[PDB]
Amino acid sequence: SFSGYLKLTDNVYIKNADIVEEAKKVKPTVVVNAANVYLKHGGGVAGALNKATNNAMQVESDDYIATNGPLKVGGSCVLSGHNLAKHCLHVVGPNVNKGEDIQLLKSAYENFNQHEVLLAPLLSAGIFGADPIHSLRVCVDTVRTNVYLAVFDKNLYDKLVSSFL
């Protein structure tokens, strides 16, 4: 199971880890991807998860978009986890760098409540441009299921833990 996580709340855990390496080790039921509405996994967590699947995540995602159209910002879809997890929950947090409503971050985290346990990144953090301290706060105040957060950056991980209220 999940090892080396710091317990933040009853249901939220956090670790300074590469989510790809974490997924390959744990092979969780659900790994969350920091997706965009088009499921174009170019960079950040999405690009790293997709590269770990040898682009199988992108091929599956393009078929999903061809059939269903784009996701909504704040929405999600469940696809295969490929070699990383049983499932991948592709969740679209608002991208502040594309001028999207930061208020949609709570809606994005609500998708996690449909899964009893998840390995996840902080939504809208990194290249999505939101404040990761705010993302962690919304996560703890929205997600009720067991979420194991992987924070890639050590310095950000330390700042998140040391400032956690």
Side-chain angles (χ1 to χ4, degrees):
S1 72
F2 292 94
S3 71
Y5 285 77
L6 172 70
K7 185 166 177 63
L8 296 178
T9 72
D10 179 58
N11 63 299
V12 180
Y13 293 82
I14 195 163
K15 188 184 177 176
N16 172 33
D18 179 334
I19 193 173
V20 168
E21 289 315 304
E22 200 62 18
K24 289 173 177 183
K25 171 150 199 57
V26 174
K27 294 180 199 174
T29 303
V30 178
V31 64
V32 174
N33 180 31
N36 54 52
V37 298
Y38 305 110
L39 303 183
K40 287 306 185 188
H41 311 303
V45 169
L49 292 175
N50 178 57
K51 178 179 168 205
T53 74
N54 186 42
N55 210 51
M57 177 181 286
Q58 190 64 67
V59 167
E60 178 197 30
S61 295
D62 289 348
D63 168 81
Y64 173 91
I65 299 288
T67 296
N68 298 288
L71 278 69
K72 291 170 185 181
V73 174
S76 71
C77 70
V78 178
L79 292 173
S80 178
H82 300 277
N83 56 316
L84 302 177
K86 176 167 188 190
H87 299 296
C88 178
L89 178 70
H90 294 272
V91 180
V92 185
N95 188 324
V96 175
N97 298 324
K98 300 178 181 170
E100 296 164 355
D101 186 4
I102 197 56
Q103 257 290 79
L104 292 163
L105 185 54
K106 188 172 182 74
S107 302
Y109 273 115
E110 289 169 344
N111 293 286
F112 287 27
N113 292 322
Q114 301 293 319
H115 299 280
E116 285 187 351
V117 61
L118 315 90
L119 167 62
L122 284 169
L123 298 179
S124 297
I127 69 175
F128 281 59
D131 178 357
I133 294 181
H134 175 60
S135 186
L136 178 54
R137 174 43 46 198
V138 177
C139 179
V140 298
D141 291 346
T142 307
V143 185
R144 296 177 303 280
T145 56
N146 297 320
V147 60
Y148 288 84
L149 297 168
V151 176
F152 182 66
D153 198 86
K154 178 247 193 220
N155 293 320
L156 173 57
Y157 171 82
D158 288 347
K159 180 168 164 55
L160 285 166
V161 171
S162 68
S163 63
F164 183 65
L165 195 35

